[model samples]
Target: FNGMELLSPKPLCSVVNCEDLEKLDHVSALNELRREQEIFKLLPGIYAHRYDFRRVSPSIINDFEYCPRLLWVQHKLGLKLLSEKSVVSIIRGRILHERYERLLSQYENVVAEYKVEIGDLVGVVDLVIKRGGEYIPVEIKTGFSKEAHKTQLQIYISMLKARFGYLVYRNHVEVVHRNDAALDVLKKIREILSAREAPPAKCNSCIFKPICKNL
Candidate 1:
């Protein structure tokens, strides 16, 4: 099977006529577009307006865990930052996911690229296996397992309300159980995103270090 067909639709903002936002720089453009889309909705018509943090994705939670300040500088300020290594890793992961998706789809009751929304948490689970009324989430990775990987799987398991989830690496698989830790992480992320000011700096070869330093 062609892998592209197995992929989910590309993510796009609800606001269709946002090309004009491109005239601004990357960060400014996204911030403005988000304002228009109400993703970063403002509250209180008069004094003391605040941004309403509407959604939380697993990746965002991971970023916050990596560095709260980084999350603030990148997402809150709309500065999309990535290094060459990060871009390459992302591309490799996508290609690997497509390959596995094509292979897994041949089996019965197997779903690929499952989009799930649980409250404010939203993410596309890499794969899901259904058997005898049981649903299991699977997360595919190109490298060895890390704390971040486990946390991601935990989030999926919690979101799916499944007993456990799988973390599939290149040569091995790990079973991750559901836990309230991911929920706590989500709460912390929401708190960070809601604040109007940047969090304290924490950096170690982070791609956003230069920008974070300046800010």
Candidate 2:
């Protein structure tokens, strides 16, 4: 917290020449997302991706299993993830993998055609191929949350578009527990994602309720 720097600072207080600025001070991670591939970091012993093995937060779906507003707050404040919940999340993830093993077996066969990069970001995709009347490609997302916006697959879409001149996603599968009332939930999510304007919904209650509903 230097004082003189704020005193008659050169017009804009440039912290320029560093790899990134707004990276610090005032920051927004989710609002300012990175492609999935660019979202990992190596800790002392393990590789960590944005998606943790712990509890799943709001992704393509929002669960009131916790609280809606808490989800809202997490997203709003850029504290959108909690690696601390990793234990339970790991258990749930394993259950999902087991349940969807056959459904996800597609990864074993697809020959990924390329790895593309934009500036410092990069992504490895499932396949780039010739489709009806054209050559296009697809990236896969196990969750089918396509614009699981915060994850890297959507960024892979952006990179694919940059190199192949088309944007495609192979993320079309979804889990529908008849008991979960699958189609109805999917429809609501579709509506939320497709709405051009922000959805007129109040943020749910969690500690984040303070800011989640735009209050």
Candidate 3:
């Protein structure tokens, strides 16, 4: 097997468009792994489950829990695979996915993979991994937020862990940024597990990364 981790930096093979597999080391192996030709590149998806979440269904519950507007965008984008941010964000997510390829087979518990299932809704999580046993529930933000909003996700984390788990915020705050206290991180993670609290909407700061559109 061509061993690759999501976090590993290996050259990619462009066999579908490339003339020679010899251009890359794993090209030959990766080519062999291909089964079907994926012949229907333009086939209109015949199923609803594969519907574009970003454009149609928005997880409003999740959005309202966090940010209503952010949720609106997510329900449309289904988590953009390639943000125009840095070439690295694109590179990072793909590479990280490669790791799941190998390790994915190793785990088969109740919640083996990263997924966001809300009743009649189904969501596939992006690059970040949320797990219960490892004892962590993380949230990565495009831009950091100074105000805190924890109720909905806290309940979700509690649901995911079937017990307690902490939410790791990727805050973009200038000073208190990444200013996570180790003990508090550990304690709050545990406290929120069985949490049942109402939420206060996060402060309405025009906080966003390189605005999604028209600033």
Better of 1 and 3 by TM-score: 1
lDDT for predicted candidate 3 compared with the true structure: 0.31
Identify the leading candidate in terms of TM-score.
Answer: 1
Model 2: which residue pairs collide?
36-152, 53-90, 54-85, 54-86, 54-89, 55-89, 68-204, 69-204, 69-205, 70-206
lDDT of each: 0.58, 0.32, 0.31
| Residue-by-residue lDDT tens digits, candidate 1, 16-104 | 22243235445455445445433332222211112223544444655677778877766655543444334334334544556666567
Q: Which stretches of candidate 3 lie over 4 Å from their true place?
A: 1-51, 54-83, 104-111, 114-116, 124-155, 166-215
RMSD for each of the candidates: 11.0, 19.4, 13.1
Report clashes for each candidate as comma-separated counts: 0, 10, 12
Better of 2 and 3 by lDDT: 2
- Model 2 has an lDDT value of 0.32
Error of 3 at 103 (Å): 2.1
Model 3 lDDT per residue over 160-184, tens place: 4433332323222121112333223
Model 2 ranges with Cα > 4 A deviation: 1-110, 131-135, 149-158, 161-215
Candidate 2 residue lDDT tens string, 1-215: 21111111111112112223224222144213323223332322222334321222224343322343333333333433333223223333323333333232234332343565433323444444433333233433333233331233334434344233222222233221112232233334434433444434443433322243452
- Model 1 residue 138 lDDT score: 78
